[PDB]
Design an enzyme around this catalytic site. Structure first.
Site, mmCIF file in Angstrom:
data_model
loop_
_atom_site.group_PDB
_atom_site.id
_atom_site.type_symbol
_atom_site.label_atom_id
_atom_site.label_comp_id
_atom_site.label_asym_id
_atom_site.label_seq_id
_atom_site.Cartn_x
_atom_site.Cartn_y
_atom_site.Cartn_z
ATOM 1 N N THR A 137 0.843 -1.238 0.000
ATOM 2 C CA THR A 137 0.000 0.000 0.000
ATOM 3 C C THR A 137 0.858 1.260 0.000
ATOM 4 O O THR A 137 1.933 1.296 0.595
ATOM 5 C CB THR A 137 -0.960 0.031 1.212
ATOM 6 N N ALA A 181 -7.758 -3.486 6.319
ATOM 7 C CA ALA A 181 -8.757 -3.004 5.357
ATOM 8 C C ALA A 181 -10.160 -2.918 5.958
ATOM 9 O O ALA A 181 -10.869 -1.926 5.763
ATOM 10 C CB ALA A 181 -8.774 -3.901 4.129
#
Ligand SMILES: [Mg+2]
Lengths: 240, 250, 231, 233, 212, 222, 244, 235
Positions: free
Chosen positions: E1, E49
């Site tokens: 990420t 997430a």
């Protein structure tokens, strides 16, 4: 625990315990609130039945909730301390979580909520107290003045009084307070506040307390001599 | 179920009276006479064993109770209320003192704990006050000998000598005339027996009278030897024979 | 009189006045009819409006695919009791992969209402219920009273003027029980039954409420133009 | 969380044209010690269901009491307790499956593998599995423990798919089960010769067979086997 | 990420990547790492997430209740602190969160708060979070000025994600751009890294090491 | 030590069309190297034109599907028989999953149906509730074998138009339900060849405006 | 059920008064008179024991004057047993504050705490209020010498001189007459005893019917001493002031 | 004394019936539903001229698609509003959608009978809950302290309710426009109010699909009052 429903409806649709709490307020010493153009003033009566008092340490009638908001009251003195404490705690809690001090409306809404809760909770009686909450919102120069009462209703006022003989001083304020042009200065606002109390107080000696709140956490309590000068000037103009 | 009496059953009347406490004191007044006298070297507490039936064994009913080795108690009023208070008084002497300081509480503090229990029954939810007045006699190292009265309200007062129950008014007057600050324990026992005779109608002997003292340490009653500092209890309940011996010199 | 201050107090004649006052609330409520055959079970309910601007209060509640009831009295109490039924129906399905028997549903309602009559502080339920359902032993109709009494019936009615409909069903007993494999005719009998309880007012399109359950028919409620067929 | 102490081995089962068969040996092992030889691990519920249990025996006995208690409870205020509202295999299973998954979710499982065999009201065969994890599955043949590895292959040669069930008679099915039990006796070190067998048929009902034994065993060839490689004598 | 957000003259730029990986396995290339808390507030995804999705959706509910009660837009300071105080209660339980709460109000102006599952709450001008944060920081630090145009600021954020997407194995897929103004955020599209890389390489002359 | 989790194998696949959606899954159920059942349905019709599968640990998979079906039922009771939209179902499932954040349902959940505009929809969840609308998603044991194939054959990834040589991408033309089913079958045939836990049978649930339809196909049983 | 027997101790009268508080105040009016007088160099606490007996052990007795800590003391008027419950709570608060801040508790803070406890019993719980009125005599380095009073309502106020218990009307007039601001402790001692001597319901005021205490800075250098007077010391001060 | 949850011999809950009397003493609130929107209007009724009338909040937003007007002991409504707002927001969180007006109303009404010896007494306030959803369109509900809620095409609560309701009986039809409804609320409020109606002692609000719930400015309402006067003088 004690669960008894003390506050309940009567056949005519009244909650007598809430109404009898108002009667306790009626007995309480008079309190008055007047907002000017750039200030709010809180006047309070001190009954002169109690002399030999120590005015240094005796609980003052006006209390700071935060550095920018104040609370005065009429009614049961012991009850008021519980509302003041809760309000002071909530003021610090608000600063801690929102990172901004309470608005005067928010603080009023909180106190009025506490009062309401005690009118439909088991094993408790309503607060025998009506409050006048005044101050200035953070980074705001508009004056704020709110009233609360045992039932839990609250509202904003250009000027308002509560307590014994509040009917008389409200009569005075209703004819003497102009909305289109409120007391422009601190002097004019304090003068009108003292004048309104002089309709009821008796002697203008140690019986009148005045607290002036201005924007940006500028709160100060007037002394005996400062107030006495207003009392002198009012009556000298009256002799005509 | 649940105890739904969570509110006070004792309340102030318009005149400022706490009714249930007054009525409890009335129950104490109806109770059999008991008394206490303090001497220079001891204390005596006494009462009449009012036997409800001659078939009943009055020895099994103990009106005079040991609370600690150096503290004893006697009462006037409702016996059952007294019995439970003695149980609570004995336990509280351990839980709130001995298990902390490793020694038995002084008379005044134990009396204070008993008073607290009685005060709570005067204010707590769903209960009536205790219908007894207690006379607690005791000794401790720093305060010496002492005698305390405890009322249903929870109020307690220290006494040189006093009486409670049926003939307390007459008994207190009798004690005022006889009491002085130079009395020995035997003299106080002699006065206790004289005072108690006035309030007793029927038989007056060691089997109808219950009498105990707080006096010298009793090593014979300790139950063990070897520790010099442990010298035995100061509380001793007088026997039927010991009472009758002093009734001849009466 | 002196023995109606709460539900925990028997009268000198052995009566529970608070329960009887709760029973009275049902009589004030609007009429509703229940009846069944061997294949189907039908609820017919007269809905009541506050005034001409207001809606008509819903009377019928679904509890499962195979069970539901009609109410008469305090509507919020019916919501509480119907919600309880919904859960019990649902517990039986999830835990035992089993549709809850209509008789057992009544036993549960009885026991829930009973606890409210023997304890201090609470109050009896102020509603009567007509439970219909189709389970492993065919069609069923129950009548629930907030006293706790639940009764299995061929047909019945509760609410104001319910006696008229109840007498009609008592005469028609032998006819409507035989209406098997014909839902329309069984509803007709229910609509004709509830009509005996009407005075002044008549059955309009937004007034009438009908529900049905059966052999190959899930519990389905009919309102609005769906019941115009039967007017 | 625990560890199983007294344990029961394989439960085997299969469907046939008119019903189901289930079997399990009568042994309660204590580790490698073959401690208890008279343990019944097939527990019938009514006249239409047989629950076969493997694994921890103390937990089996608990489950046995729950099922006994279930029959009692079903009878309460139930005029049709022996008719339309009698306990079905599917009700009994779903109840157990709920309990097994709940217990695993509290990290305190019933240390078992269970097979519920029975016949439903409409004559349909019921055969489903559940274990300590609350895992469930159904199949024409079901087996626990060693049975899964050795019994299923043999039973699947008879009923390999759903369409083979109507073609399989009770005699052929019972024969396959009995043969499978023999194979497990040869090869499972925690098995016994004595076993119980239950048949639940939609026509002839519940037939419970106790004190069965593995017979027609082949051991004679052992005499010829000598040494571990090179040894002749 | 790789996620970034920075304050500038024209408000705030928020830029994120789109990749999701479970070990070496690329689970998704189309993940939304910008939560649209409400029309004026944005939040970024790093770490967990679900933790991000759940609690920042929840944050939006708390912000909505605030402005219903107070009849006033919630401050970025207050909105960030609601989320940080929440995760702090869960500290130790194993929540995974690294997010920038981004917003533009009257009293504050453009404001960015970095919020952390350790309970950290930091106000700042430039933030980069994720496995490819160091690559994005390099491009940002060397090219950042307060007086950037909205057009150039948007490109800088896009280019900084591209820098990370290239080098960082666990970043890529596509770039999502947002521009936060006082009247609310404005979405500036999804940009595939595959097509963007070649476009940037040619037009910018960068990535000479790579053969195209 | 007691291990509350297990792996029941299996592989599922959801594909969103233009005006339809499919959710497929093999019917094999396993532990370790043993087959429990050759036909154990894994994809379920949950009502309201929604289909669902919770692949992985079957006990948590069954528990979740059961609770969601239950949530659909109570949504009808509480909100006047309103239809539960696919997006609403997805959010609801997130809360069911996140409810057990610190003792998760060990499953990879996928639902499929139509959105409120009538277009095909597939939602994909992780074990702890993070979810997302997608066009294409394989889940379970052979997910890594299927997804790359789908990137290539559904989204036309790495495919360009002949003659242009890498300059023009292959256009993303819409696939019919017949075309999708072919890709589903070939995905499961390939997965069966190369993954031991995949086989026995394939069951596909197709969702359109007309309702839910089922299709079953045989798979290799080795 | 139980509702039938509930007195409802925490309700308003139609006039807006708390029945039980008013009746508790009536109870307190029959209690022995307690007086507090504050001077520039100390505070005096004087109190009358109620109709005592000759057989009462006075030197070990304590019904009126209690010590809360080294700086703060209280005079009691009402139910002694109720007062001791509150006194022990007050003693604990003082120690909690000392443990927390490592400084002796300011007088007002202690008074507010006890007064808030009393308040609670008038607003919730359904229990009877404490039938007690306190006079708080104390010292701290902020306000110096302070006198307070609290009553069953939970209301407290500050005083220069004040009485509680019996004949407060007569006592408060006598104090208001002879009190001055520049007054000293030895003068306040004399005023306190003279006031009790005139307001008492007894025939004559004697040492055995009195409890007496002083809080003085008359301790060696900058510090405060509490002096609970012994029976012989009360007898001496009665002769000194010329009452006996 | 007597139980709080006691039934009268007629079969009604004493406390609920008594709370309805408190609502009769409250200031008038009127709601009118149309196919172009729902209008909510209230009488402010300030107890003194020094009371700043704009601080009187008797019309309140629950969500963007749901509004609310109150009458009676208005302090009691605050926790009802709080719950309503929490329920509306919570449902959006769980289901990613707006909550149905009926479902919201039902959630509020579930609080009503949660009293006994839970809260110590019923609510002393009635609510007019107006809103819009996609399933049943524009809706107006009347939520009582009994737990019962009726849907209405138009409804008046408070001191001038029965007089206002009789007027709403005649005036309402299914083809009313939003502007027609606004004037109709103002007309009936003016009729039942003690003091003369103006923009300071009366308040208007509406809920439309496009713009959502909106409280009207005093300037906007003043124009509608002036428009009303002229159309009444027109015949
Ligand atoms: Mg394979």
């Amino acid at each position: 625990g004690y669960d008894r429903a003390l506050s309940i409806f009567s056949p005519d649709g009244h909650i007598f315990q809430v109404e009898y709490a108002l009667e306790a307020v009626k007995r309480g010493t008079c309190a008055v609130g007047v907002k000017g153009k750039n200030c709010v003033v809180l006047g309070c009566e001190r009954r002169s039945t109690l002399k030999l008092q120590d005015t240094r340490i005796t609980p003052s009638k006006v209390s700071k909730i935060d550095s920018h908001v104040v609370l005065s009251f009429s009614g049961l003195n012991a009850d008021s301390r519980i509302l003041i404490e809760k309000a002071r705690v909530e003021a610090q809690s608000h600063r801690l979580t929102l990172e901004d001090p309470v608005t005067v409306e928010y603080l009023t809404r909180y106190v009025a909520g506490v009062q309401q809760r005690y009118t439909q909770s088991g094993g408790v009686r309503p607060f025998g107290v009506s409050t006048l909450i005044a101050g200035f919102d953070p980074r705001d120069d508009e004056p704020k003045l709110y009233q609360t009462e045992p039932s839990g209703i609250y509202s904003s006022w250009s000027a308002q009084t509560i307590g014994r003989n509040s009917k008389t001083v409200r009569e005075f304020l209703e004819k003497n307070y102009d909305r289109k042009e409120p007391p422009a200065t601190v002097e004019e606002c304090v003068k009108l506040t003292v004048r309104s109390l002089l309709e009821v107080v008796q002697t203008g000696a140690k019986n009148i307390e005045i607290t002036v709140v201005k924007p940006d956490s500028d709160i100060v309590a007037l002394s005996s001599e400062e107030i006495n000068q207003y009392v002198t000037q009012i009556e000298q103009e009256k002799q005509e | 179920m649940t105890d739904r009496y969570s509110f006070s059953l004792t309340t102030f009347s318009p005149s400022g009276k706490l009714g249930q406490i007054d009525y409890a004191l009335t129950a104490v007044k109806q109770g059999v006479t008991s008394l206490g006298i303090k001497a220079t070297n001891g204390v005596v507490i006494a009462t009449e064993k009012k036997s409800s039936s001659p078939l009943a064994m009055s020895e099994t009913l103990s009106k005079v109770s040991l609370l600690t080795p150096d503290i004893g108690a006697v009462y006037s009023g409702m016996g059952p209320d007294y019995r439970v208070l003695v149980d609570k008084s004995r336990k509280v002497a351990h839980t709130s003192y001995k298990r902390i300081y490793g020694e038995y509480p002084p008379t005044k503090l134990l009396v204070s704990e008993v008073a607290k229990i009685m005060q709570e029954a005067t204010q707590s939810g769903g209960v009536r006050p205790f219908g007894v007045s207690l006379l607690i006699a005791g000794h401790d190292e720093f305060n010496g000998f002492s005698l305390y009265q405890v009322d249903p309200s929870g109020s307690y007062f220290p006494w040189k000598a006093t009486a409670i129950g049926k003939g307390s008014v007459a008994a207190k007057t009798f004690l005022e005339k006889r009491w002085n600050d130079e009395l020995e324990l035997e003299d106080a026992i002699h006065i206790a027996l004289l005072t108690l005779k006035e309030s007793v109608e029927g038989e007056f002997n060691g089997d109808t009278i219950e009498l105990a003292i707080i006096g010298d340490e009793n090593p014979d009653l300790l139950g063990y030897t070897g520790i010099p500092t442990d010298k035995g209890p100061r509380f001793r309940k007088l026997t039927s024979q010991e009472i009758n011996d002093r009734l001849e010199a009466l | 009189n002196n023995y109606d201050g709460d539900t925990v107090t028997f009268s000198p004649t052995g009566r529970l006045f608070q329960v009887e006052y709760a029973l009275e609330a049902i009589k004030q409520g609007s009429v509703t009819v229940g009846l069944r055959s061997n294949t189907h079970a039908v609820l017919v309910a007269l809905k009541r409006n506050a005034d001409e601007l207001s809606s008509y209060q819903k009377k019928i509640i679904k509890c499962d695919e195979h069970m539901g009831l009609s109410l008469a009295g305090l509507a919020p109490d019916a919501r509480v009791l119907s919600n309880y039924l919904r859960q019990q129906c649902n517990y039986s399905s999830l835990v035992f992969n089993r549709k809850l028997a209509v008789e057992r549903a009544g036993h549960l309602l009885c026991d829930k209402a009973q606890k409210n009559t023997q304890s201090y502080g609470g109050r009896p339920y102020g509603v009567g219920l007509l439970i219909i359902g189709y389970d492993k032993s065919g069609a069923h109709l129950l009548e629930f009273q907030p006293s706790g009494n639940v009764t299995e019936l061929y047909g019945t009615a509760i609410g104001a003027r319910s006696q008229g409909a109840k007498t009609y069903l008592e005469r028609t007993l032998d006819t409507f029980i035989k209406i098997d494999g014909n839902p329309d005719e069984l509803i007709k009998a229910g609509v004709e039954a509830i009509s005996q309880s009407l005075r002044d007012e008549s059955l309009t399109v937004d007034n009438l409420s009908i529900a049905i359950v059966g052999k190959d028919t899930p519990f389905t409620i009919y309102d609005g133009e769906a019941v115009a067929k039967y007017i | 969380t625990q560890q199983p102490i007294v344990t029961g081995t394989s439960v085997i089962s299969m469907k046939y044209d008119n019903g189901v068969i289930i079997a399990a040996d009568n042994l309660g092992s204590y580790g490698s010690l073959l401690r208890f030889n008279g343990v019944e691990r097939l527990i019938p519920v009514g006249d239409n269901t047989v629950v076969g249990i493997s694994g921890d025996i103390s937990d089996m006995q608990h489950i046995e009491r729950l099922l006994k208690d279930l029959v009692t409870e079903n009878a309460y205020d139930n005029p049709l307790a022996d008719a339309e509202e009698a306990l079905e295999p599917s009700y009994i299973f779903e109840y157990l499956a709920t309990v097994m998954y709940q217990r695993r979710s509290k990290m305190n499982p019933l240390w078992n593998a269970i097979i519920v065999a029975g016949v439903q009201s409409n004559g349909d065969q019921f055969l489903r599995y559940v274990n300590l994890l609350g895992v469930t599955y159904s199949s024409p043949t079901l087996a626990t423990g060693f049975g899964a590895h050795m019994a299923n292959p043999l039973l699947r040669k008879v009923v390999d798919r759903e369409s083979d069930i109507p073609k399989t008679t009770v005699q052929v099915a019972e024969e396959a089960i009995v043969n499978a039990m023999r194979v497990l006796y040869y090869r499972d070190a925690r098995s016994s010769r004595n076993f119980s067998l239950a048949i639940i048929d939609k026509n002839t009902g519940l037939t419970f067979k106790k004190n069965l034994q593995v017979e027609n065993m082949k051991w004679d060839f052992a005499k010829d086997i000598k040494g571990y490689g090179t040894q002749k004598i | 990420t790789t996620t970034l957000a920075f304050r500038f003259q024209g408000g705030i730029i928020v830029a994120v990547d789109s990749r999701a990986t479970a070990g070496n396995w690329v689970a998704s290339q189309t993940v939304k790492k910008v939560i649209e808390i409400n029309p004026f507030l944005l939040g970024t995804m790093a770490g967990g997430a679900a933790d991000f999705q759940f609690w920042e959706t929840w944050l939006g509910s708390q912000c909505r209740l605030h402005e219903l009660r107070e009849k006033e837009r919630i401050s970025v300071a207050a909105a960030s602190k609601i989320l940080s105080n929440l995760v702090y209660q869960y500290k130790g339980a194993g929540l995974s969160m690294g997010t920038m709460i981004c917003g533009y109000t009257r009293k504050e102006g453009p404001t960015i708060y970095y919020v952390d599952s350790d309970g950290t709450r930091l106000k700042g001008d430039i933030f980069c979070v994720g496995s490819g944060q160091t690559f994005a920081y390099g491009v940002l630090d060397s090219n950042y000025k307060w007086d950037l145009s909205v057009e150039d600021a948007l490109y800088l954020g896009k280019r900084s994600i591209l820098a990370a997407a290239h080098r960082d194995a666990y970043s890529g897929g596509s770039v999502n751009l947002y521009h936060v103004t006082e009247d609310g955020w404005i979405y500036h599209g999804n940009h595939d890294v595959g097509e963007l890389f070649w476009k940037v390489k040619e037009e910018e002359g960068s990535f000479n090491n790579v053969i195209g | 030590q007691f291990n509350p989790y297990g792996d029941n194998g299996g592989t599922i696949l959801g594909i969103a069309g233009e005006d339809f959606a499919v959710l497929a899954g093999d019917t094999r159920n396993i532990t370790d190297y043993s087959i429990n059942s050759r036909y154990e349905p894994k994809v379920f019709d949950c009502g309201d034109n929604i289909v669902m599968s919770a692949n992985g640990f079957a006990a948590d998979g069954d528990a979740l599907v059961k609770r969601f079906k239950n949530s659909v039922k109570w949504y009808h009771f509480d909100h006047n028989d309103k239809k539960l939209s696919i997006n609403s179902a997805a959010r609801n499932i997130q809360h069911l999953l996140y409810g057990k954040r610190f003792f998760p349902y060990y499953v990879h959940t996928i639902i499929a149906g139509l959105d409120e505009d009538g277009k095909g929809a597939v939602y994909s969840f992780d074990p702890v509730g993070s979810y997302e609308r997608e066009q294409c998603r394989a889940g379970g044991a052979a997910a890594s074998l299927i997804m790359p194939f789908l990137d290539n054959q559904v989204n036309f990834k790495n495919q360009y138009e002949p003659g242009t040589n890498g300059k023009v991408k292959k256009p993303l033309k819409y696939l019919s339900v017949e075309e999708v089913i072919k890709l589903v079958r070939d995905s499961f045939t390939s997965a069966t060849e190369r993954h031991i836990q995949v086989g026995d049978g394939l069951e596909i649930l197709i969702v359109t405006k007309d309702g839910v339809r089922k299709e079953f196909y045989e798979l290799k049983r080795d | 059920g139980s509702r039938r027997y509930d007195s409802r101790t925490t309700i308003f009268s139609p006039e807006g008064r708390l029945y039980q508080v008013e009746y508790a105040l009536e109870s307190i009016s029959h209690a022995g008179t307690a007086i507090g007088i504050m001077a520039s160099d100390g505070i005096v606490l004087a109190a009358e024991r109620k109709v005592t007996s000759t057989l009462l052990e006075q030197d070990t007795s304590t019904e009126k004057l209690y010590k809360l800590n080294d700086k703060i003391a209280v005079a009691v008027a009402g139910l002694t047993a109720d007062a001791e419950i509150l006194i022990n709570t007050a003693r604990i608060h003082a120690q909690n504050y000392l443990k927390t801040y490592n400084e002796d508790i300011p007088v007002e803070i202690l008074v507010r705490r006890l007064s808030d406890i009393k308040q609670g019993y008038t607003q919730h719980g359904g229990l009877r209020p404490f039938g007690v009125s306190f006079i708080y005599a104390g010292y701290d380095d902020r306000y110096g010498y302070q006198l307070y009073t609290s009553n069953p309502s939970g209301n407290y106020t500050g005083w220069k001189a004040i009485s509680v218990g019996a004949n407060t009307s007569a006592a408060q007039t006598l104090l208001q007459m002879d009190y001055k601001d520049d007054m000293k402790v030895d003068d306040a001692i004399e005023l306190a005893l003279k006031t009790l001597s005139k307001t008492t319901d007894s025939s004559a005021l004697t040492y055995d019917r009195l409890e007496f205490a002083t809080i003085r800075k008359g301790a060696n250098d900058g510090e405060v001493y509490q002096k609970i007077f012994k029976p012989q010391e009360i007898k001496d001060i009665l002769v000194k002031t010329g009452i006996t | 004394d007597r139980g709080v949850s006691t039934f009268s011999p007629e079969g009604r809950l004493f406390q609920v019936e008594y709370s309805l009397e408190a609502i009769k003493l409250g200031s008038t609130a009127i709601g009118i539903a149309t196919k172009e929107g729902v209008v909510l209007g209230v009488e402010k009724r300030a107890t003194s001229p020094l009371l700043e009338s704009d601080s009187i909040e008797k019309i309140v937003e629950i969500d963007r698609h749901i509004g609310c007007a109150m009458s009676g002991l208005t302090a009691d409504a605050r926790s009802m509003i709080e719950h309503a707002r929490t329920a509306a927001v919570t449902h959006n969180l769980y289901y990613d959608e707006d909550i149905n007006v009926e479902s919201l109303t039902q959630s509020v009404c579930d609080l009503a009978l949660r009293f006994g010896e839970l809260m110590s007494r019923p609510f002393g306030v009635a609510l007019l809950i107006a809103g819009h959803d996609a399933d049943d369109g524009y809706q107006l509900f009347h939520a009582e302290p009994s737990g019962t809620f009726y849907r209405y095409n138009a409804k008046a609560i408070g001191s001038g309710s029965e007089g206002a309701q009789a007027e709403l009986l005649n005036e309402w039809h299914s083809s009313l426009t939003l502007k027609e409804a606004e004037l109709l609320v103002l007309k009936i409020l003016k009729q039942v109010m003690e003091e003369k109606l103006d923009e300071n002692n009366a308040q208007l609000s509406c809920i439309t699909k496009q713009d959502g719930f909106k409280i009207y400015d005093n300037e906007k309402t003043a124009e509608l009052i002036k428009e009303l006067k002229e159309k009444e003088a027109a015949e």
